[PDB]
Amino acid sequence: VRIEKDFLGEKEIPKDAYYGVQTIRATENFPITGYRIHPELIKSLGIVKKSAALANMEVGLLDKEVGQYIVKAADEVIEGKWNDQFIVDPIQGGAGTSINMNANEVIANRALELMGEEKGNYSKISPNSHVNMSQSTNDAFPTATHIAVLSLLNQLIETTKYMQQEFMKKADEFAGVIKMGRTHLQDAVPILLGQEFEAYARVIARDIERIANTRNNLYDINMGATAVGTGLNADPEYISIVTEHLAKFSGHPLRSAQHLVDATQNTDCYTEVSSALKVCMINMSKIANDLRLMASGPRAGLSEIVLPARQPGSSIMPGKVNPVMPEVMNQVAFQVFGNDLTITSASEAGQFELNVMEPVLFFNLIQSISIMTNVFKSFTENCLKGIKANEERMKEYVEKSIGIITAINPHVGYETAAKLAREAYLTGESIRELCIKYGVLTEEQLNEILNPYEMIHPGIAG
Amino acid sequence: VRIEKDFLGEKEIPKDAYYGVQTIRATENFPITGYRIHPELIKSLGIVKKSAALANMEVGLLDKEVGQYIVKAADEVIEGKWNDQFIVDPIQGGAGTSINMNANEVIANRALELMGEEKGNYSKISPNSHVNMSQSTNDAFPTATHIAVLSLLNQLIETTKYMQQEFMKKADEFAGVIKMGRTHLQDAVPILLGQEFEAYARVIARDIERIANTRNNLYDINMGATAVGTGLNADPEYISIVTEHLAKFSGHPLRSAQHLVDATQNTDCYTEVSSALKVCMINMSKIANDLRLMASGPRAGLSEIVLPARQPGSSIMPGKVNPVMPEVMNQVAFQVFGNDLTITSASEAGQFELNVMEPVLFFNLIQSISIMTNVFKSFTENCLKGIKANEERMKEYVEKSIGIITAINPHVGYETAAKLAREAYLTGESIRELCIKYGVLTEEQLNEILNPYEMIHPGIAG
Amino acid sequence: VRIEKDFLGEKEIPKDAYYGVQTIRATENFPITGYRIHPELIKSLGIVKKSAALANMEVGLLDKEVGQYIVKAADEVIEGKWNDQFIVDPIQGGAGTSINMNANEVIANRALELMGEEKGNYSKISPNSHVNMSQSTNDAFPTATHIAVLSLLNQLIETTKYMQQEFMKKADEFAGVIKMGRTHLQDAVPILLGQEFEAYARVIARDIERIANTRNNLYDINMGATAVGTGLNADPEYISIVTEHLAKFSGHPLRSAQHLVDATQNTDCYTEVSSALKVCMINMSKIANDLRLMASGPRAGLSEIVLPARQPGSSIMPGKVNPVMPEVMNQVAFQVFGNDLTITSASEAGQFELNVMEPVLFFNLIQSISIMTNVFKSFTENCLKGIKANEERMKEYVEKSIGIITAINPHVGYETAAKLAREAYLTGESIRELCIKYGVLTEEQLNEILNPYEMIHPGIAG
Amino acid sequence: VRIEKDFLGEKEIPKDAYYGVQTIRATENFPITGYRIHPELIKSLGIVKKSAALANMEVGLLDKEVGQYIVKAADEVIEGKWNDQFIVDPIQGGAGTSINMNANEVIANRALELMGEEKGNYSKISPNSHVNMSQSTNDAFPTATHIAVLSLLNQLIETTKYMQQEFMKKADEFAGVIKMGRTHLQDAVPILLGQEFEAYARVIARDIERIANTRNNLYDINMGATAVGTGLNADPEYISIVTEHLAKFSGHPLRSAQHLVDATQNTDCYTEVSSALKVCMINMSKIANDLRLMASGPRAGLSEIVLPARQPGSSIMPGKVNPVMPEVMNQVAFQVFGNDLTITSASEAGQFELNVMEPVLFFNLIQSISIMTNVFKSFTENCLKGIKANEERMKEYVEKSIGIITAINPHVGYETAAKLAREAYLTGESIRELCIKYGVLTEEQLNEILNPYEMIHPGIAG
Ligand SMILES: [Ca+2]
Ligand SMILES: [Ca+2]
Incomplete structure (x- = not known):
């Protein structure tokens, strides 16, 4: 257990944790759903902090000795090595400050550890001053x-x-x-x-x-x-x-x-x-x-x-x-x-x-x-x-x-069709076994009218 | 034709109309749905204004000479006699003000007519000062x-x-x-x-x-x-x-x-x-x-x-x-x-x-x-x-x-019940027919078990 | 006064009205909102029926005698002459059948009238067989x-x-x-x-x-x-x-x-x-x-x-x-x-x-x-x-x-900028007064740093 | 690992796991959110199972020696000891069948372990026949x-x-x-x-x-x-x-x-x-x-x-x-x-x-x-x-x-109140100050009128 300090007081942070006091206060403020942010968003935060570290080094704003380790830590976040350290609730007030600070704290502490320093030594590498620089x-x-x-x-x-x-x-x-x-x-x-x-x-x-x-x-x-x-x-x-x-x-x-x-x-x-x-x-x-x-x-x-x-x-x-x-x-x-x-x-x-x-x-x-x-x-x-x-x-x-009397209709006429429909309704007799009974259509010509393809596509009628 | 003045200016109003210049201004602001408020809201506004007039007159705040005509005009509004005079769009800015003022104007002007005066004569009976008094x-x-x-x-x-x-x-x-x-x-x-x-x-x-x-x-x-x-x-x-x-x-x-x-x-x-x-x-x-x-x-x-x-x-x-x-x-x-x-x-x-x-x-x-x-x-x-x-x-x-087999099961047992159901589903035969031919239940036994009432209500085995 | 007949019995229809029985049956089935369909929908129904008539006449399916008056009547619908005759509720069962038959009956009855026939004489021009043909x-x-x-x-x-x-x-x-x-x-x-x-x-x-x-x-x-x-x-x-x-x-x-x-x-x-x-x-x-x-x-x-x-x-x-x-x-x-x-x-x-x-x-x-x-x-x-x-x-x-202190900050340093902002917030004095009071900057410098444009666009401070 | 067979085949289950193949089946069908049901629902499933076990035993349906262990196992679910064993997705097809069975399996396997049997020995204590009896x-x-x-x-x-x-x-x-x-x-x-x-x-x-x-x-x-x-x-x-x-x-x-x-x-x-x-x-x-x-x-x-x-x-x-x-x-x-x-x-x-x-x-x-x-x-x-x-x-x-004029209004008449409000709007002079300068009200009179309680509660015109 380690000892970080806040405008609200001291908080004991486990030595194996890469987050710090701000992330903890966030969990105190918003124990809403118990969920953690999507690992793709975690990866994406790493990308942002990598890009920003690189740009700040390039324009002379960020010390190259610390930036180098900031980049190495962010890379590890990108690879999904630190998913468990992102503990803030997705439903949080503060418009995402907690999420951002969780990413700054974790990357700063992993950077410090990569350069053989202690965690929490934000004088060497600041979550706000360095990791969040220009952001x-x-x-x-x-x-x-x-x-x-x-x-x-x-x-x-x-x-x-x-x-x-x-x-x-x-x-x-x-x-x-x-x-x-x-x-x-x-x-x-x-x-x-x-x-x-x-x-x-x-x-x-x-x-x-x-x-x-x-x-x-x-x-x-x-x-x-x-x-x-x-x-x-x-x-x-x-x-x-x-x-x-x-x-x-x-x-x-x-x-x-x-x-x-x-x-x-x-x-x-x-x-x-x-x-x-x-x-x-x-x-x-x-x-x-x-x-x-x-x-x-x-x-x-x-x-x-x-x-x-x-x-x-x-x-x-x-x-x-x-x-x-x-x-x-x-x-x-x-x-x-x-x-x-x-x-x-x-x-x-x-x-x-x-x-x-x-x-x-x-x-x-x-x-x-x-x-x-x-x-x-x-x-x-x-x-x-x-x-x-x-x-x-x-x-x-x-x-x-x-x-199906709709498919037959134009080969026999509106007259014949309605008599066949009304009879097939009362007696429940097949429409096919009724066209042949009365003799209005031969077994052979029913076969091309009641063909699966013909019945379900545009073609000859009136 | 009639002519009333507003802060936006002078407006020509039909001779017949009982609404005034503030209603017309509200139809210009909000020509939104083209709809009209429900007659039941038209009716309740009538109840509101009549009740106000009656209270005010009794409290010695409204002139009893004017108040009784306001009441008379409101009673007509309650009877659904002036629904056509409520022309404001239900979807409107102003928090309902227009709706209120539509009722005030209409009740003012009609009261004025009932006592022989001109409509638009807001010096005599005012939509704001008299019809809207205390509210x-x-x-x-x-x-x-x-x-x-x-x-x-x-x-x-x-x-x-x-x-x-x-x-x-x-x-x-x-x-x-x-x-x-x-x-x-x-x-x-x-x-x-x-x-x-x-x-x-x-x-x-x-x-x-x-x-x-x-x-x-x-x-x-x-x-x-x-x-x-x-x-x-x-x-x-x-x-x-x-x-x-x-x-x-x-x-x-x-x-x-x-x-x-x-x-x-x-x-x-x-x-x-x-x-x-x-x-x-x-x-x-x-x-x-x-x-x-x-x-x-x-x-x-x-x-x-x-x-x-x-x-x-x-x-x-x-x-x-x-x-x-x-x-x-x-x-x-x-x-x-x-x-x-x-x-x-x-x-x-x-x-x-x-x-x-x-x-x-x-x-x-x-x-x-x-x-x-x-x-x-x-x-x-x-x-x-x-x-x-x-x-x-x-x-x-x-x-x-x-x-059906769920009713039959306890009179046959888990084993035979399942083999019957399985065979019925695969062969397409009715469960009754199978019970007969395998001799497991008699035609009379099955008529007592598959009793429409017993099959659909709580009750142990036999 | 006119008598069209439906499967639901004999029904009186105003002789002024161009809609028929299928339309007032929908008025009985669906007395829901009291609203009428949009004039633009009415217009487009007219375009649909005009187009149909033309295409049916061209392929040989529609009588050219009857079809010409359907077209003429459809144009009148298109041009807004008949909005009043569409009375069905936009919220209705029948999947739009009534909206479609509203248009069919109205166009038939006006085409009959133009031809010198009687409204309702659907043996001559039918809302189903002619106006709704092939659709x-x-x-x-x-x-x-x-x-x-x-x-x-x-x-x-x-x-x-x-x-x-x-x-x-x-x-x-x-x-x-x-x-x-x-x-x-x-x-x-x-x-x-x-x-x-x-x-x-x-x-x-x-x-x-x-x-x-x-x-x-x-x-x-x-x-x-x-x-x-x-x-x-x-x-x-x-x-x-x-x-x-x-x-x-x-x-x-x-x-x-x-x-x-x-x-x-x-x-x-x-x-x-x-x-x-x-x-x-x-x-x-x-x-x-x-x-x-x-x-x-x-x-x-x-x-x-x-x-x-x-x-x-x-x-x-x-x-x-x-x-x-x-x-x-x-x-x-x-x-x-x-x-x-x-x-x-x-x-x-x-x-x-x-x-x-x-x-x-x-x-x-x-x-x-x-x-x-x-x-x-x-x-x-x-x-x-x-x-x-x-x-x-x-x-x-x-x-x-x-x-304002975010602008001044790079010209004065973090320590003094934070000093001044805290003092300004606690005392109610303007930052500008405090910069002069301690002579950290002069009026002239402040007027150039606090340029409206420069405080609101990107660019390095020095 | 242990071996449970399914209508879909063999599946390895960890030694320390109390759920079974049906639960694993569910996780393969429905890998939707990765969430687990609420501890409160887990507890309640326990209450359901224990209540059912006691009822089945009393009525002679469930074996009292098996039942006792079932009840003790369910009690541990109620106590919140087996929360990690509930792995099915809250969002699932099958109408809760797998939530139900997740509970059936877990209790069966803990009942088995308590009575000195092997887990997955569903011939002794069935998740379906015993833990889910009469439900x-x-x-x-x-x-x-x-x-x-x-x-x-x-x-x-x-x-x-x-x-x-x-x-x-x-x-x-x-x-x-x-x-x-x-x-x-x-x-x-x-x-x-x-x-x-x-x-x-x-x-x-x-x-x-x-x-x-x-x-x-x-x-x-x-x-x-x-x-x-x-x-x-x-x-x-x-x-x-x-x-x-x-x-x-x-x-x-x-x-x-x-x-x-x-x-x-x-x-x-x-x-x-x-x-x-x-x-x-x-x-x-x-x-x-x-x-x-x-x-x-x-x-x-x-x-x-x-x-x-x-x-x-x-x-x-x-x-x-x-x-x-x-x-x-x-x-x-x-x-x-x-x-x-x-x-x-x-x-x-x-x-x-x-x-x-x-x-x-x-x-x-x-x-x-x-x-x-x-x-x-x-x-x-x-x-x-x-x-x-x-x-x-x-x-x-x-x-x-x-x-604040609204409080003053009745004590000076509307005419006077409008003048004071208008100047207050032009000059910016406090309404209180204006009342003094025009002598409409004494400083002491303002103290009764402009009193917080008086201003905010029903109180009349003088
Ligand atoms: Ca097949
Ligand atoms: Ca205070």
Whole structure:
């Protein structure tokens, strides 16, 4: 145990800890959720502190002997070597100061240790003076967040694409599977199961497109903004160098925003991201609902498809296969809807040159991207690739249906069709085994009218 | 044509019009939705002004010569005689001031006409000095709203109670109708359709209680608050008297709030109402979702219940009955959900001594109550009463199901019960047929065990 | 007085009215809000039906005698002659069937009248067989909606651009006005009032881009889809010709969707639009909150700006001007936020081949575009143009602020800068007095360091 | 490692682990958030299992020698010793099946270890047959949740009551502190700081009552409902006995619901609780916004209150004390709003006999109560108790205001009051000074009229 001192008094900090008194006070102030910030945000903080250390050394502001160790420590943070030292709550007042200071304290203490000094000796390496040199909370925090959000969006994009590609493969696989289209949940006209899955795949491709476009506004960062965006005393060469480093180490084509005040006080880039995720989850939710309806049964349901079994069934009641993978998809969508409201409210609560409600916004943005990335993985792997069709049941739904008289209609006339429809309604007799009974269409010409392909695509009529 | 002057200038007003230059200025500021305030709010403003005049005259503050004509004019407003004269947009800046002034002008000008004077002659009877005497925007507008909301809620309770009883009648009409319970949309164990319709009756009874209890915090009113709630220059006798008239003429047991500063700045009684209406519509939307599933078909659906046709049918596809009445119920649910978010945002936006976002708040609270009332009566009259059951088809479902085995199990044992269920599901035979052919139970034994009542109620083995 | 017959019986229809029985049945089924659909939707229905008629006549499907009067009647609808005749509630079951049949009946009955026939004589011109020929509810309704929303969006874009520019004008006008930046509502470092208004202009510039970009997906229409998306019985020449007309008459670069099943069952174009509307109103609400803060006072507030007076005064209380215009703006934002949730819920609610929740979805989308257009136009005219800066009071705030010391710091050193700021804060003396008192700097040096421009832009101190 | 086989195959389980393959299966299906269920829910699952074991033993269903060990194991779960063994994601498909089984496995394996057997020997003590005897997922899970939410609500009530009591203590402390009331952020009329704090204290009192009344519907549990609510095969004696037990071990007055189907498929008790939490946070956010506004400054803000400092300030920026405790209060409210939408959407998604979306619902409800309890504690101990007033600053807002004229008005007539207000607006002369210079009132007369208590309480015209 070690002994750090504060405007509030002494606090005993374990010798093996890299955080200090400020981080502790933060945990005292905000024991709200018990969560820790996403390791990608931790990594991103390291990137910011590395870039800034490097830039400050380059412009002569930071001593090269201490900077060298500051860089080595930050690198270790980037590699995920110190995740457990980041202990502040994601829901914290102070507009992210605690998060920023946790990163400054840990990097300063690891630097000091790397140079054979004691921890807490902030005279040698100051969390504020050296590690946070030329930065404010108001630029270090949002810039690390932009970077972390962008990296997680690239992962969600490559996971959604994989999933989208597998929906397409199912579409192709069910390309000739004839079924009964439903509107208002009432039997309509024939459709191909492959057309439904292409529908799912096409909406998902438009989701990928929307989510990808939201990265553009995140590429503008406010590094060099200082407290408010005015850049008071900031060296314009520091700004140029720090941005360039941030882009190189993050892997993103970062730009210094054209108007730093704007970039410092506005939060539309995050609401833009959340909006696209919500839209995407709306579509996923609907698809999941369909999949669950289609899997219903086995005897009093639609029983159109089979989903892979993913929980042990009742060992005394077969046939009951709960669609747990789509269900979880639905509940995530619901998280994301809720997350989006929180983001919305946090964003409109901004005042003058800072929105102080970012910590709950970022926590929610990051949670959204992360849970989506994770359900897409498990749904794809555990449900989607394995989906099978009950093609006999769906073909019988079509043959015994009334709506197929729409395909026959123009070959026999509005007269004949309505008599056949009304009789198939009262007697429940097949429409096919009725055209041949009356002799209006031969066995051979029914076969080209009631063909799966002909019935579900534009072609000759009146 | 007539000509009144304002701080913005002289305005030409139609000869017939009873509103004045401040109403016209409010229609220029806020040409927002093109909508008009609810006639029930128009009515309550009438009750507010009449009560004020009566109190003021008695306190010896309003000239009895003018006051009696103000009263007469207000009575006409209460009768819904001048609804067309309330032209201000419900979505307006000014914290309701325009709404208040719309009532003041209209009641001033009509009073003036009743005593032979010119309209626009504000020297004789003033909208501000006489019709608005002793009251502020921040007491008249909210008080009228309480009275209007409460009146509206009373109608909803009455209508929701009627709907609840009709659900309960269907529960009894369906009391012996056996069917398949579904969990996760998968077949489970038997249930009666009457148990589901009693499930619906009960949640609705719970909503009625919740909605009813939100009345209490609305009975407290802030009349005499003046600008801020401190009641500076207000007369304690005017306060007691106006409150007693407001209670007598509105029909509600209205009370003067204990702390008028609290009553002027806080808006929780409004969000308390919306919440109970949100909860109610979650249940109704779900109920409606079930009904649309239950009415699905006719051939490729569930086909458990038949809903009265309200849409004309095609002569190409009979048996296609779209469940439009549950559909519109679903859509009203979604309105109310959205309205509740708007109420939330507007309520949390209060500042110091006054919430200025009250109009959009009140507009949404009034619309939620009104549209619920309307959908409830229409759903009750054009759907709920006419619902019929497909008993024969539901009995089939039960006969061919696997869940059935849960009733059979304790008369056979874990081992044989499971092998029967497994074989029934794989071969497609009914569990009854298998019980006969393997000799495990007699046709008579199975008729006693699969008793529709015994299968769906608590009770040990034999 | 006229008697049209429906499956629900004999019904009296005013001989003035151009709507028929299917329309008043929807008035009975859905007496929900009392509202009528947007004139822009009405117009687009007219474009849809005109286009249909032309395309049906060209392919040989429609009688040219009857078709010419349908076109003529459709033009009258397009030109706004018949708005009164559309009486159905925008919140309705039937998935837009009534909205579509409202348009069908009105166009038939006017085309009959133009031909010299009787209203109701549908044996001559039928609202189903002629006016609705080759179209389903499931394509004419959404196609009309796409056109309407697109038209409205183009209007909102023009208005929003006008507002944006007006913000840039104020940016330039205030480009020399110095004041205190606030982070956490706590005094920070100086900022130009112009940088704050430029920040507003830029986020609005991003809202315009985001909203404009939502148009692309609405350009894809599904005319030709029949019930479900397959185009069962459709003629490909009808589809290419109708699509060409719709695009010419609407003024929009419409395309037939590549996959009609997808374009028929998915609703992600509408949620995409609403999202960009919500995002915009988040920034606009924030801005407006700022304006109300900046305008607070005149004695116990901030008093940084004056907004045009838009409501009458109290001669008893001058100086009091409520910022009603930013107030209505915050309120329209709370509405759009609610509108967005209603839209989310309705879009998530889709099932298989059709989302039947489209009517409440569309009502809310159209409402959000309309109310945003209206407040933007009004806010620009009645507030934004005439905003004034209180230069004197803001320079006052700056001279006695502590943050001023961030500018002086590099010219005097940390130890003396901190000394002076602590003393200035505790004693209430200006930093400027204290720099002279101890002669750490002279009047002349202070006037050059404290240059408005240099304190608010990046650059090395020396 | 040990070896448990699954319908999906072999899986290695650590020697020290008490969960099994079903739990591992769950973690592979649902790697969504990485969170673990709340300790309170864990405890409650323990209470459920112990109550069920005791009931099953009494009724002769469960072996008393196995039962005794099961009960002892469950008691250790209740005691909080096996929290780390609960590894399943709160967000999961399967309607809580894996939360339920996680508890079944853990207790079985500890019961086995206590009775000297090998773990995974489910032939001795089965998680399904023994630990889960006479229960389904569809009753154990919700029953545990009712119990857990009740316990957490009772803690929230106590905490909020404490905060409330402290808000009242501060109203008394500021009972004579005079300030300027604000409407539209415009100076209005004098108010006491204590009157504001009483308004705060009073809204919270109403929140306490709302949240408390929410407990009633939760007292009804569905224990004994089995799959669907029908109680097929359930011993009625077991039901009433397990109910008496659950009430006794949980400390709540639990009652067996009067209709088990209703209780099994409806979730209105959850949405009701959440609505009451949301309303509470609407008020709390509003209060924090005022506090933050009043803390603003120190030189260019309002600065009416000082809040205890909770972060280390900048040594060169004294006076800058960010209101971090209110800021975190806002962020939690925003969180609760979104949580409430997720809940709304989860409840709405119920189908027939089971709402499978309960996991994301319960996760959200519990987080809402939890984070509320936690901010309330921290805000009270670190902010509220220590709030102090700048009474001089506030006093001079009142001396220098125009609105102080309202107190003078009746004593000098409106005509005279308007003249004095107008000059006060032009010159800047105190209204008090003006009254002296024009001799309208004696210095001693002003002392009665402009007395803090007199100015802020009902008192008449002379
Ligand atoms: Ca197959
Ligand atoms: Ca003091």
